[PDB]
Design a protein around this ligand. Structure first.
Ligand SMILES: Nc1ncnc2c1ncn2[C@@H]1O[C@H](CSCC[C@H](N)C(=O)O)[C@@H](O)[C@H]1O
Ligand SMILES: [Cl-]
Ligand SMILES: [Cl-]
Length: 271
């Protein structure tokens, strides 16, 4: 009943290259949306660079696996950059994966704007490797209060089972981002709130399966994986990632084993 979690500082392609085909159940992907100066030696645009890990991501996913890709739809056209649409368009043309849902993360607060509608959303593209993708809706249903539940149980037109299990969360999630006073905050500039990752982990992966994140950033995926009983592999190219990861652990003050080093990826792949 003990889960395994491996972490290390690596480039995404180097991590993927060490993972065998169909060995991962879920991938959390919140990638940078611009290439680096040196990348111009081999590419002419963002997708040219991104196509490599997107292909590798699909390769390591199991037949029942899925990948959630975070991104926006505000790309302006700057060379070397792109957004979630650049990725989706590429996938429609070159991948057999299915777009099972385009989730809208609608957050409450943000900056104001005088010349346009203030931005209050970012997206999550959920891609499934095949039609046999795993999905656990009941694990993420939102229960009605005892009052609403009662009013529905009296309505013979409605199914009692559905009422008791709760409502489908829908593909529009109203969840707030982390603020400067959040207890989760480890220092990463774009740290994602555990709440959003949790819903993905619960709905798109089963207990004891492997969750992979090669742009781990703050290491939030490992914390969620540990909490939900999943195994995990988290890597990020930034040396500071190790610090964030260790910090995530302190939040966990349960049976799990932490292992450093890409050479040990296997520990987290074992079912
Ligand atoms: N080649 C690479 N391999 C692995 N990780 C990389 C990488 N290039 C960047 N990263 C890491 O990926 C993470 C991206 S955070 C991006 C958040 C959000 N998508 C946004 O655009 O604001 C960072 O932690 C960064 O260190
Ligand atoms: Cl959708
Ligand atoms: Cl993060």
């Amino acid at each position: 009943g003990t889960t395994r979690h491996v972490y290390d500082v690596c480039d995404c392609l180097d991590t993927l290259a060490k993972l065998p085909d169909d060995s991962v159940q879920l991938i959390i992907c919140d990638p940078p949306y611009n290439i680096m100066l040196a990348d111009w030696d081999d590419h002419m645009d963002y997708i040219g660079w991104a196509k490599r890990w997107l292909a590798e991501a699909e390769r390591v996913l199991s037949p029942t696996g899925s990948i959630a890709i975070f991104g926006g739809l505000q790309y302006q056209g700057e060379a070397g950059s792109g957004d979630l649409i650049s990725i989706i368009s590429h996938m429609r043309q070159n991948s057999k994966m299915l777009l099972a849902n385009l989730i809208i993360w609608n957050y409450p607060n943000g900056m104001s704007a005088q010349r346009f509608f203030a931005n209050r959303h970012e997206e999550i593209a959920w891609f499934a490797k095949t039609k046999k993708y795993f999905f656990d809706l009941d694990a993420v249903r939102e229960p009605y209060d005892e009052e609403t539940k009662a009013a529905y149980m009296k309505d013979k037109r409605l199914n009692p089972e559905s009422v008791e299990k709760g409502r489908n969360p829908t593909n529009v999630w109203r969840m707030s981002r982390l603020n400067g006073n959040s207890l989760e905050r480890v220092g990463h500039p774009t740290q994602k709130p555990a709440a959003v990752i949790e819903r993905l982990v619960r709905a798109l992966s089963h207990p004891g399966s492997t969750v992979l994140d090669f742009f781990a950033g703050s290491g939030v995926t490992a914390r969620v994986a540990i909490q939900e009983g999943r195994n995990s592999i988290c890597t990020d190219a930034a040396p500071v990632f190790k610090e964030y990861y260790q910090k995530q652990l302190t939040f966990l003050q349960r049976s799990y084993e932490i292992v450093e080093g890409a050479a040990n990826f296997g520990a987290a792949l074992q079912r």
